[PDB]
């Protein structure tokens, strides 16, 4: 059934699971034509497929060529997403395949269910959580690889960097969702918070800065302030 606050520790048990987010698969700019009509131009996208226990991010880059000559692109995008997730599962050893796939938007359920009929033991689930995975394209290194791609491509990341050496999966996912919620509510402020100190660098093989335990607490507190602030500047509270 649906994933919600009441079964939140299930994410970090030992049953392999993946979140799938399709919110950045089909991306467009809208612009005026010479005749004063409106047109779209697609730009590269990505499927965001994440193991919340390990941090392993399977980032499938969606190159704009895949939309050429196609109609009803928003509907096609959900089926393209489902096709790519199904291909990923089939490419993994059986012992690495997920027991459950949690989609962040309900319109992915039927496309993924149909693409995974070959896998009746894999549960396809929605969630009542409003997870901020759309903001993945605010992580500079992920945005960079997506926009540079000249062809379809799969890139593998650990979105937790080395955090699991020091904290549990539950805490790593809580930090990740707090960072992404901040980047979604005010990207510039969020990014300023993350870089304001020139002495704390991002290692070549990481996505986020090399904060100490103490500095992560500071950062996390400032990110919560921002989310509360913006919530006041938004609702005038």
């Amino acid at each position: 059934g649906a994933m919600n606050s009441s079964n939140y520790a299930e994410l970090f048990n030992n049953d392999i699971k993946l979140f799938v987010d399709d919110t950045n698969v089909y991306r467009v700019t809208v612009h005026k034509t010479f005749e004063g009509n409106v047109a779209t131009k697609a730009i590269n996208g990505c499927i965001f497929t994440l193991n919340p226990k390990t941090g392993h991010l399977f980032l499938k880059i969606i190159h704009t060529s895949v939309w050429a000559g196609q109609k009803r692109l928003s509907q096609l995008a959900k089926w393209k997403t489902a096709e790519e997730v199904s291909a990923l599962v089939r490419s993994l050893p059986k012992e690495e395949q997920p027991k459950q796939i949690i989609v962040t938007r309900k319109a992915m359920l039927d496309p993924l269910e149909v693409h995974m009929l070959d896998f009746p033991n894999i549960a396809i689930r929605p969630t009542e959580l409003r997870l901020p995975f759309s903001a993945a394209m605010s992580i500079d290194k992920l945005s960079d690889v997506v926009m540079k791609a000249t062809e379809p491509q799969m890139v593998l990341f650990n979105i937790y960097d080395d955090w699991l050496d020091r904290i549990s999966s539950y805490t790593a996912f809580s930090r990740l969702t707090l960072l992404l919620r901040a980047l979604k509510t005010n990207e510039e402020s969020a990014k300023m918070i993350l870089l304001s100190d020139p002495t704390i660098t991002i290692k070549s093989y990481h996505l986020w800065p090399s904060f100490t335990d103490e500095q992560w607490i500071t950062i996390e507190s400032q990110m919560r302030d921002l989310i509360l602030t913006e919530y006041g500047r938004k609702y005038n509270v």
């Binding site: 096609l76 089926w79 149909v114 009929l117 070959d118």
Partner: protein, 300 residues
């Protein structure tokens, strides 16, 4: 014109013969139904006065034998049986016809309702859905489940309708996932029509039988089947034009006959709005859409 003779009516009962119904009082001098039109299947159905729960009945064709009803006080129901002694049966029926102990199938001359509801229904196909090979007639009740209902518990008392499941490997060609799910023509025309039913007449016969079982007995499995068979056609972009025209006629007479006070339960809002207003065939069912809009505009 054929006759179904009754040994007697020991318990008070509402008796149904096709779309007609009448009441018999306990121990009333009732000995059956005469003037039944040859050339159509028929259904004789029952609702006990003292336990209005569980309607039950028998599908039969008078060309296939001499049938009669006799109450069983151990099992507590009116049972259909077959008399193999023809001369005995004709003599019995003649005695009751002379004493005027039988009601008359009151078919109005102008009236093609039953034909129109049963055009494609054939006893031989009924007997494949309702498996009870020793009898020429077929028993159905309110509570009987379908083979697919049993997949989601007695298999001998099941309704063996054709399983239709839109999210199944039968319905979806590897590599045509989006195509086949959004346009069900492959599943309709290749899997179901060419592969399983062989022709549209067999498909329409099962569709009509499911509706009649759903309406006469309140059979949940039959209602699910009728709606699924409508939805498979409406969700196919490519349907032979003669099938669409005939479907419109079929559905028109089913909606016309439905008692107004059971529409609430016999009609699935989602399937009908989808079929009439969103589907590929939203503009293809002119007669059915006009009667639905004039009779049941709440549902829509």
């Amino acid at each position: 014109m054929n006759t179904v003779p009754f040994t007697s009516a020991p318990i008070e009962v509402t008796i149904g013969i096709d779309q007609y119904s009448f009441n018999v009082k306990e121990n009333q001098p009732f000995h059956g139904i005469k003037d039944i039109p040859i050339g159509h299947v028929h259904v004789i159905h029952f609702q006990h006065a003292d336990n209005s729960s569980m309607r039950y009945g028998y599908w039969f064709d008078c060309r296939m034998g001499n049938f009669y009803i006799q109450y069983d006080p151990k099992d507590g129901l009116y049972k259909m049986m077959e008399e193999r002694d023809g001369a005995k049966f004709e003599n019995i029926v003649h005695n009751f016809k002379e004493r005027q102990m039988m009601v008359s199938y009151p078919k109005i001359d102008e009236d093609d309702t039953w034909y129109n509801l049963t055009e494609f229904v054939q006893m031989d196909k009924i007997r494949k859905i309702v498996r009870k090979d020793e009898n020429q007639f077929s028993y159905v009740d309110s509570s009987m489940t379908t083979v697919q209902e049993n997949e989601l518990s007695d298999p001998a008392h099941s309704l063996n309708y054709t399983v239709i499941n839109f999210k199944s490997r039968e319905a979806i060609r590897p590599g045509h996932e989006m195509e086949d799910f959004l346009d069900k023509s492959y599943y309709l025309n290749t899997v179901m029509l060419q592969g399983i039913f062989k022709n549209s007449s067999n498909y329409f016969g099962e569709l009509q039988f499911a509706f009649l079982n759903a309406m006469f007995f309140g059979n949940y499995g039959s209602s699910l089947q009728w709606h699924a068979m409508i939805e498979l056609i409406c969700s196919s972009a490519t349907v032979p034009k003669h099938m669409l025209d005939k479907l419109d006629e079929i559905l028109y007479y089913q909606i016309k006959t439905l008692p107004e006070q059971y529409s609430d339960i016999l009609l699935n809002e989602r399937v009908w709005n989808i079929c009439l207003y969103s589907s590929f065939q939203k503009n293809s069912l002119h007669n059915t859409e006009k009667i639905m809009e004039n009779k049941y505009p709440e549902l829509l």
